[PDB]
Paper text:
We structurally characterized the paused ribosomal complex (XBP1u-RNC) by cryo-EM and single particle analysis using a mutant version of XBP1u (S255A, full length numbering), which was shown previously to pause ribosomes more efficiently than wildtype XBP1u. The average resolutions of the paused complexes were 3.0 Å for the post state and 3.1 Å for the rotated hybrid state, respectively, with the ribosomal core reaching a resolution of 2.5 Å. The majority of the visible XBP1u nascent chain adopts an extended conformation, except in the proximity of the PTC where the AP forms a prominent turn in the tunnel. The turn is comprised of eight residues from W249 to W256, and involves the C-terminal half of the characterized XBP1u AP. Interestingly, residue 255 that has been mutated from Ser to Ala in the sequence used here is part of the turn: A255 is tightly packed in the structure and the larger Ser residue may be sterically more problematic, possibly explaining why the S255A mutation makes the XBP1u a stronger AP. The turn in the XBP1u AP makes several key interactions with the tunnel wall and is in part in close proximity to the PTC. It is framed by two tryptophan residues (W249 and W256) and protrudes into a hydrophobic crevice in the tunnel, causing the displacement of the base G3904. The positively charged side chain of Arg251 in XBP1u forms a stabilizing salt bridge with the phosphate of A4388, whereas Gly250 and Gln253 engage in hydrogen bonds with A3908 and U4555, respectively. In contrast to some bacterial APs, we observed U4531 (U2585) in the XBP1u-stalled RNC in its canonical upward conformation. Therefore, the premature positioning of C4398 (C2452) in the closed conformation due to its interaction with Leu259 in an unusual conformation provides a mechanistic explanation for PTC inactivation by inhibition of A-site tRNA accommodation: Leu259 would simply clash with the incoming Asn261 tRNA.
Author numbering:
A (entry chain L): 2 to 159
B (entry chain Y): 1 to 134
C (entry chain C): 54 to 312
Write the structure that this text describes.
Amino acid sequence: APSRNGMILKPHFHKDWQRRVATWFNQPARKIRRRKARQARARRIAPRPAAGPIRPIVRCPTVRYHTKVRAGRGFSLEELRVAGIHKKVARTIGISVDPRRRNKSTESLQANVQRLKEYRSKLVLFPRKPSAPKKGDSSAEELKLATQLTGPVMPIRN
Amino acid sequence: MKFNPFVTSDRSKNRKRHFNAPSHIRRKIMSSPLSKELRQKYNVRSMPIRKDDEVQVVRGHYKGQQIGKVVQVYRKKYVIYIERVQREKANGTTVHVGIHPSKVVITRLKLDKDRKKILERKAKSRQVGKEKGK
Amino acid sequence: VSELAGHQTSAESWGTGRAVARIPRVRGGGTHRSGQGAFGNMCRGGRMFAPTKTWRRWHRRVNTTQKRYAICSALAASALPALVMSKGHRIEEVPELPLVVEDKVEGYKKTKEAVLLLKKLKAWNDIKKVYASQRMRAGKGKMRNRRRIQRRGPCVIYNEDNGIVKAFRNIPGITLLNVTKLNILKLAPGGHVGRFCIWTESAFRKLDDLYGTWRKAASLKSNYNLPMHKMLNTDLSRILKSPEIQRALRAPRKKIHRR
RNA sequence: CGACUCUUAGCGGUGGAUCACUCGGCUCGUGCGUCGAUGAAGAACGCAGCUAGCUGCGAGAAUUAAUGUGAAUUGCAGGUUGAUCAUCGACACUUCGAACGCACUUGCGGCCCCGGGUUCCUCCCGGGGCUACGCCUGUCUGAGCGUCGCU
RNA sequence: GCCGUCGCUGGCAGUCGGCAGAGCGAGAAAGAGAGUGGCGCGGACGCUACGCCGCGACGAGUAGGAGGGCCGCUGCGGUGAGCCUUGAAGCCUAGGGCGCGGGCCCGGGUGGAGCCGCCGCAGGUGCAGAUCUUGGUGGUAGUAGCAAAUAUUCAAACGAGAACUUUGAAGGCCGAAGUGGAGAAGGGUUCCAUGUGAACAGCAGUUGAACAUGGGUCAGUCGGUCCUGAGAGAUGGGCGAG
RNA sequence: UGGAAUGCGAGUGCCUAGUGGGCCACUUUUGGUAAGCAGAACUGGCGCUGCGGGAUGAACCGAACGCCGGGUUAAGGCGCC
RNA sequence: ACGGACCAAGGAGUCUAACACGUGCGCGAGUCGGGGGCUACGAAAGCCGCCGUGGCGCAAUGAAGGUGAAGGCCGGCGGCGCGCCGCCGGCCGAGGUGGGAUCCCGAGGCCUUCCAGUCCGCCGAGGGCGCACCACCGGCCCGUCUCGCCCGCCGCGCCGG
RNA sequence: CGCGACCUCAGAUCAGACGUGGCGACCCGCUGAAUUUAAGCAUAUUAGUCAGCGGAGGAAAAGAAACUAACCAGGAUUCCCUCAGUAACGGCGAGUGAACAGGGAAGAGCCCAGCGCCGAAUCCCCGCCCCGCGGCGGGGCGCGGGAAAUGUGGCGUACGGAAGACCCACUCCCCGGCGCCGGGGGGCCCAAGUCCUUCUGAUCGAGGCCCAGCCCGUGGACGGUGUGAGGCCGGUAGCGGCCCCCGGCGCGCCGGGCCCGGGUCUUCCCGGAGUCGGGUUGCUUGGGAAUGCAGCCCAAAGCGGGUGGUAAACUCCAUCUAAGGCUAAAUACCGGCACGAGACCGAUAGUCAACAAGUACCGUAAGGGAAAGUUGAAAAGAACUUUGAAGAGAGAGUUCAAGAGGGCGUGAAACCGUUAAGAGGUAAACGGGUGGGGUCCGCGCAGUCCGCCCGGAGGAUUCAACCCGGCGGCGCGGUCCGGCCGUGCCGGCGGGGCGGAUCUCCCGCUCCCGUCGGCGGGGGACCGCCCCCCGGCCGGCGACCGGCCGCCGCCGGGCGCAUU
Ligand SMILES: [Mg+2]
Ligand SMILES: [Mg+2]
Ligand SMILES: [Mg+2]
Ligand SMILES: [Mg+2]
Ligand SMILES: [Mg+2]
Ligand SMILES: [Mg+2]
Ligand SMILES: [Mg+2]
Ligand SMILES: [Mg+2]
Ligand SMILES: [Mg+2]
Ligand SMILES: [Mg+2]
Ligand SMILES: [Mg+2]
Ligand SMILES: [Mg+2]
Ligand SMILES: [Mg+2]
Ligand SMILES: [Mg+2]
Ligand SMILES: [Mg+2]
Ligand SMILES: [Mg+2]
Ligand SMILES: [Mg+2]
Ligand SMILES: [Mg+2]
Ligand SMILES: [Mg+2]
Ligand SMILES: [Mg+2]
Ligand SMILES: [Mg+2]
Ligand SMILES: [Mg+2]
Ligand SMILES: [Mg+2]
Ligand SMILES: [Mg+2]
Ligand SMILES: [Mg+2]
Ligand SMILES: [Mg+2]
Ligand SMILES: [Mg+2]
Ligand SMILES: [Mg+2]
Ligand SMILES: [Mg+2]
Ligand SMILES: [Mg+2]
Ligand SMILES: [Mg+2]
Ligand SMILES: [Mg+2]
Ligand SMILES: [Mg+2]
Ligand SMILES: [Mg+2]
Ligand SMILES: [Mg+2]
Ligand SMILES: [Mg+2]
Ligand SMILES: [Mg+2]
Ligand SMILES: [Mg+2]
Ligand SMILES: [Mg+2]
Ligand SMILES: [Mg+2]
Ligand SMILES: [Mg+2]
Ligand SMILES: [Mg+2]
Ligand SMILES: [Mg+2]
Ligand SMILES: [Mg+2]
Ligand SMILES: [Mg+2]
Ligand SMILES: [Mg+2]
Ligand SMILES: [Mg+2]
Ligand SMILES: [Mg+2]
Ligand SMILES: [Mg+2]
Ligand SMILES: [Mg+2]
Ligand SMILES: [Mg+2]
Ligand SMILES: [Mg+2]
Ligand SMILES: [Mg+2]
Ligand SMILES: [Mg+2]
Ligand SMILES: [Mg+2]
Ligand SMILES: [Mg+2]
Ligand SMILES: [Mg+2]
Ligand SMILES: [Mg+2]
Ligand SMILES: [Mg+2]
Ligand SMILES: [Mg+2]
Ligand SMILES: [Mg+2]
Ligand SMILES: [Mg+2]
Ligand SMILES: [Mg+2]
Ligand SMILES: [Mg+2]
Ligand SMILES: [Mg+2]
Ligand SMILES: [Mg+2]
Ligand SMILES: [Mg+2]
Ligand SMILES: [Mg+2]
Ligand SMILES: [Mg+2]
Ligand SMILES: [Mg+2]
Ligand SMILES: [Mg+2]
Ligand SMILES: [Mg+2]
Ligand SMILES: [Mg+2]
Ligand SMILES: [Mg+2]
Ligand SMILES: [Mg+2]
Ligand SMILES: [Mg+2]
């Protein structure tokens, strides 16, 4: 029995909702648990970045969002072929790779190739054996100065 | 305050762990301080009492400067019985009045090998704490 | 209260006739609980009216600007002389009420040296008041791990922790606060404003970096200015007996005219 | 002033309300997240010097061994080269029960090996190990006017 | 005369004091206003301005609405250099009282260990009823009742105590399809001895199927065990999401 | 010369409980023999309301109500109760 | 008429979500970290702005394709019959009427011995700018209906304004 | 007919293994209602819900597009915010109701069949030797037995792959053992008063501990001890100590497997069938000319097939590779073990169960299912005398208290007994008003004080006024000197930190022939705001002062002498 004036309303409480009530009192404990797991991963991979491998400069679909730029799933195979990095070497040196992506635009292709060229210069590759370094390894002055990068590595700014 | 998240600061749980403790924890709880002379000599603050110890009663009705031998240590009622600390029943028999070991000081220790080992370990821990404080 | 409390018993109502009060009663049996009455808030045992739920709205959020206004008011009332004594602090022997101490207070690591610092600052009367007002809690809170109660003492705000927390936490009454992590619940205990605080030099200099003046914005925060005064000259007595207002007034009609 | 009845007060009985205590619940959060044919869950029956219930245990039966602890358990008696406690990693774990030799009466079997009986001569008694269904790999024995090769 | 409500959005910061001049109840729009030429150190209360004070009128109330509670219960953050084994809470009171009232404070007794005032916060927060739920207790009421199947009497013994126990004698009944002697199902120590009279045996009991200590069921032939009946129920097979 | 008398501070916007069974009375009046019957019009009461009177009394007459003292009436009465 | 021997204890508009209105606070054409991340009480608190993504509000309307919230005046030129339409340069540039609390101007006067006479206040005839708000008249945008005339070209059209 | 193979099917108490059942809070697959609402009810709704059934794990499931979109395109799965109570479904009624994208937590990719190359290059079991044997593994020796061509292993899987030729550059990846150096579980310990008086039955109560303001405190959480304890005890805090067990990060050695990559050119190859899809029916979905699943019938194709939220034909496009499989993480947990906390409950409350609780008891059974805490600090649980047969008492005794006496803390009301007082034929009881009698209270019973003055009797080392020192108030000192501040303003041959959608020598990248144009970053110049030095006004010190000076008041010490 509605009164004088008010909004029409459809409360979705006609089911037995009280059995399925997800209380959110686990929330600060889960914040502590995510924090401890993230610090555990950061202590596990000691020179590597705590965030992870780098993620591409990505245009958005669906015309509401295409002015904005995201961080994507991984680099394209044509991007890796132009930059000169093998797709199995890239996963080992800390580069996100996905085979599903295409390259229709040339400008975003050149931008991700340039970001690969910047990341190859910024990368400090440690040798496999410390006693016997190889040809493609970093210098001994860089071995001591190399450390973690807090936050996302090369944060994509619009 | 306490900062260990596993140490209980709950009244009912602490009373449960007290009144339902097994006998080796009953012995640890039922401990008594040593005298000033024995404390200066051994550098030991307190020890668990034994059946063959000497006691001056500090608090209660039977307190004084009377050094009495322990009759036996009754850990079920958390009590000890002392030789001259007793009273007369109605019929005439003497019943040892129970004294809790917290109101009990030791004038002479009964020293066996395990007793000397516990005293040396407590003196060693006291010396380590004193060296860490220095 | 658990949802199964009262509903574990199966109880069909006896109907009408039987000259019973039309209540769901326990289905038979050769025991005391047989035809007794299980469901309903008024029956012995069973359920109560309105079982308290886990999904009660326990938590209330406050706007960030209101939180910062509460912090600024709780800090600003800690400088006025009357508002600190109206909280209750014995401050008669304290040499200056904005008590700013040197940066050697973070260097202390001993409670004996902290007590000696409180003696030399002559704020020990508040801690002795806390010792005198350690008493027993009234009611059923004693069996709910709230046995001993005492008075809150002087707060101490530190910038860096170099043993100041270890030196000052064992003295009963003193709450320690960091400069960037000031709390409303500790700056204003019980909703009453003007708790006595003890600042260090770096903590007293860092407040202008935190909140700024009215012409300089917050350097550490993103966008926060000081709140605006509704009136500047809050002393209305000097406003009332001023030559500007008292010229353009009428005559006071103070003659009492009775019937 | 009588007896009986009504009201108030002191006291004494029926009764256990109120208050104060709480080795208990309820809620929330954390870590672990593990049963069983090498016999689970559960059930039955026994086990204490005096022992009904609870608790613990399995004919080694309120416990065995090992480690740590270091003079007791106790209601009453009895007796430091380790009593009592906790951990428990070794040993043991009656009968049903997925329950397993077929049935559930605690009944009836079958095979092999030991000791009384024998002097392997068959019974009888006692002890021990097997004997549930389905299915996987391999082995053995087989069946087929199924497909063939030789005489 | 007193209480409360409403209105005058009435009045009060003017307690302006040898740094002074003590007022704006008075029928009459507006100043106890500035200028320039012709001895004795003195004066009650006030004003938690969410307070104080003065005028007038008004005062019923169901359902219902709103406001004030320095009315009451429980817990929390503060606070009272709070109370307390030289006596806390609870309870009783022919005592002293206060408030319109909700209720509250002291005096006396009991009690033995916690409790309360103020500012806020929160609720499982106030009972006279619901043929309300639980527990307890009255009138009825020392009342209805201890009335189906013929019947008991005397003496002695144990014992503190005898209508009921035991023995003897007398008189009766069930009158061999029994009130007799034995079984099945079911009961499970009820069977037997010794002791008790706390509780039960709707009176009593020295008695009992009650209580507490102890004992008692001996099989090749008596049954089960074996067989099959009416039937039940595995294997193969079929069906079925299971 | 606020263009009759008299009286009174007015206008306006939200949110909104309860109610949606009524009854009685001077006058008018429908149906019915009539009804303490059923159904209407105006207004007032009861409902929601105590008080004095009608001995008694939900509606009649008077008169509406904070707690009291002095006086005075209404409606009714002044043999006794 | 129903419930009700008596007494003690328990006992009935609570909680969550959504919406409306009123009030208090903070910020303000902005507001909000609610989700995430960083630093005993503390599971609290503080912080993030290239974590304001996103919600709500600042723009509505149409079923949709879509569209989307003042104008006036002067000069010059072209067309048509001093008047109208179209195209370029400067100015005025955010509606009006009435009721409107408050504010502004001040014809005059507010007294101590008569006139002259400056400054501070104070009241007021009468005249104004007019807050909010109310009632109306106008104006603008959008969908729809009627009457007709012009403008533009990358594609001269069943085009667009 | 006999012998020997293969194929199908048997029998084994054959040798070696596995499954059965339980718990089930979370998870997966089925099956699956009616209450209720629509103010009736039948579609709907409750609701893929309750109940029923099967199956695991510590998580399960899902999962690396036969995807979303139509944009300058994103890119496995899972979970949160938002999309959004929206698109949509619905007697278009009641009601139901997603997905994309964006921000995050997490982030990890892959393997087969086919197609093909390699002497089956492959796998299991048994005999012997060496190591290790409580997760039965590694190597060697066997004309040992089988599996497998009706196809095991290596390369290889949609991101292309294989083979051949030509260039470039390395020779270190994994498994199983032995020893050595430097978080988890268990056990034992580590500070300070029982200090002097005073209460008490007992202190943990109260006072003090002076000049080291009793001692410790990285320990003033909690619990016990004869009420209330930082210092009596267990503990508490501590990058505190000691002794065992376990795993991991590394080093050194032994036995092995492996002879492994990338770019360019040439030649070949490439895909999952009663499956997709269509018709029909039933369930389901927001999915509406049918989203998904299932039953029947038809039944494919290879520049093919699926999707592109309105059925169909033509036409270009966009985007994936279905009909095979594996995979942690973020996610869920009212069951279990070990824990921690509480603005909760305080024995009719909180779980049914604080206690011999799923117990006693009831029902043939499935099932139903209670009530029940408190002596005291310590049993110190009442010796002994006496009446009674005893239950019961009376003395005596313990305890602070028996007015705490074995269902005993406190002991209310209803009800009952006794004593005291008052009363009694309109049932009792009540409201207003008095009267009388009792209980105690006013510790009443010659009755309250407070200022000024007069008069008579007394007593101080004292009044006013001066001297010195200190403190306080004010100062329009008309306008003293000096500091501080301003939610007030300026000036600068001043030095800086932020912000800006104000402009323009060095470094990096690609395109073109050391040069010329493009993009980004860093200086550099411009403006706004702020900080610090100055120089000058205004204003304040009455949320914010120093020194003298002048006045007043107060305090302390000197005097001053009794008509004060
Ligand atoms: Mg309504
Ligand atoms: Mg991330
Ligand atoms: Mg610790
Ligand atoms: Mg309950
Ligand atoms: Mg209380
Ligand atoms: Mg009680
Ligand atoms: Mg009870
Ligand atoms: Mg037994
Ligand atoms: Mg042993
Ligand atoms: Mg041992
Ligand atoms: Mg049989
Ligand atoms: Mg009136
Ligand atoms: Mg009223
Ligand atoms: Mg009474
Ligand atoms: Mg006590
Ligand atoms: Mg509550
Ligand atoms: Mg009641
Ligand atoms: Mg009689
Ligand atoms: Mg009779
Ligand atoms: Mg018979
Ligand atoms: Mg017989
Ligand atoms: Mg017998
Ligand atoms: Mg009887
Ligand atoms: Mg069958
Ligand atoms: Mg009605
Ligand atoms: Mg009606
Ligand atoms: Mg009528
Ligand atoms: Mg009325
Ligand atoms: Mg009336
Ligand atoms: Mg009459
Ligand atoms: Mg009349
Ligand atoms: Mg009168
Ligand atoms: Mg009369
Ligand atoms: Mg009736
Ligand atoms: Mg009725
Ligand atoms: Mg009745
Ligand atoms: Mg009650
Ligand atoms: Mg409404
Ligand atoms: Mg509002
Ligand atoms: Mg076998
Ligand atoms: Mg299973
Ligand atoms: Mg319905
Ligand atoms: Mg209905
Ligand atoms: Mg119906
Ligand atoms: Mg459904
Ligand atoms: Mg189910
Ligand atoms: Mg498992
Ligand atoms: Mg899985
Ligand atoms: Mg997606
Ligand atoms: Mg929305
Ligand atoms: Mg319709
Ligand atoms: Mg649905
Ligand atoms: Mg998305
Ligand atoms: Mg192959
Ligand atoms: Mg794929
Ligand atoms: Mg204590
Ligand atoms: Mg003391
Ligand atoms: Mg303590
Ligand atoms: Mg102390
Ligand atoms: Mg200690
Ligand atoms: Mg210690
Ligand atoms: Mg269905
Ligand atoms: Mg459906
Ligand atoms: Mg198409
Ligand atoms: Mg596939
Ligand atoms: Mg697949
Ligand atoms: Mg906590
Ligand atoms: Mg109880
Ligand atoms: Mg009880
Ligand atoms: Mg109780
Ligand atoms: Mg209960
Ligand atoms: Mg009791
Ligand atoms: Mg007592
Ligand atoms: Mg008592
Ligand atoms: Mg007590
Ligand atoms: Mg009692």
